Symmetry: none
Subunit: 243 residues, 2 copies
Amino acid sequence: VRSAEVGTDILKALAELSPATSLSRLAEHVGMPASKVHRYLQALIASGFAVQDASTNHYSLGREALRVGLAALDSMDVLKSAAAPLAELRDVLNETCFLAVWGNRGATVVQVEQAVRAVTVVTQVGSVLPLLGSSTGLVFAAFLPEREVAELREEELAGADPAAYAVLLEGIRARGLHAIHGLLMPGVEALSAPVFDARGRVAAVLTVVGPASIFQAEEQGPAAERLLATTRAISWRMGYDGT
Amino acid sequence: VRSAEVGTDILKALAELSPATSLSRLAEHVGMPASKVHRYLQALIASGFAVQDASTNHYSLGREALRVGLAALDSMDVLKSAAAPLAELRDVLNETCFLAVWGNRGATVVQVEQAVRAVTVVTQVGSVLPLLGSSTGLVFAAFLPEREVAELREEELLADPAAYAVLLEGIRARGLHAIHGLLMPGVEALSAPVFDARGRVAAVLTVVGPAEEQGPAAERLLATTRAISWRMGY
């Protein structure tokens, strides 16, 4: 019955309580009487899901807590978690949305939800976008280390203003997304936001696209919030705490 | 208090059977009726320790499980201490890097940072590598009290003892071991210890691919592992 909830509701608040916690701080977190917490604590210590330190008496997560968690982290897959919200974001905007991840050649489109209109522009799965010429490529540059972008970026500048470049990447973070007006192809406007994993690493970039007529790619227009709501959702479902 | 633990029991099956499982396969594993399992599954879903996949009777671990994984790692001063430096080192090294703590069953890998690269070589976060068959374990053998690992060493049975002794003196003198092929024909290995506040080995940092005790990669690994000690150890 009810006892399964309270058990892991306690485990969830133990994790939330840093590395070590006392009983009163624990019961105050999950909002239950101290006595019931102490009772279920005992079970969680038996099951290995919690431990009590020998010299300080503080409660912390057990090795069972660690092993389940590492199974979870081994199971993260932005391609799984994103597939439904991508299609939902497409259906509310009726604009083509796509997911890209970072591959040996940069932004690589791996999944696409097209807009159904008489005629529509699209990326296609398997397309590699430019690092500095697309909105997908700029979010990547904004959020990945300098070291894993620089080489392909240097291959790109054989085909200026570094200062302006550095101020723009600081902008894309301050703002959390990026809009482009035809930069990759004039007359097509894109919008891009990043998706993070549990550990905060850039998992993917999610991106809305469409010609200037129907789609206004403004960094603060109702598409932008839908975009962010979608990407913050995909993130939080992968464990990301939002900071 | 009794059925508090069947809740977590189903959690542990969900982990063993991850990424996903049919409810029926999950029930056979725990040896309980499928209806009883199905109901406990909803308790954890409300808690967020489990979700239900696109097949509306197929389950997988929930977002809270990641939270508990990461807190557990924070709680042993490995997470926020090694999170960055492990990914810096992958960046410069051009090869997959990973971190392993000493767990109940041996060296258990707690974070894997893989290179961006046509073909890499990975190990699963949360998997266990052998004490004597892996550079990650051999290092643990070199720097851990003989007491703590004598069980698995005896369990795996370099047999002759004096051969053991030579290799583990050498690994301490050098400060790392690099394997070639003891996991599998074609490993690169190269592992180095990480020391906690009191000087014990709290983790091992292992880069992998298809392997030198002496060249360029060894210094940046030793540089990153010798550094990482002070914000965890001192």
